[PDB]
């Protein structure tokens, strides 16, 4: 879900 954040 951090990466989600992240990348998005
Ligand atoms: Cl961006």
Same mark, same amino acid.
């Given at each position: 879900?951090?990466? =989600? $954040? $992240? =990348? =998005?």
């Amino acid at each position: 879900p951090x990466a =989600a $954040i $992240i =990348a =998005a």
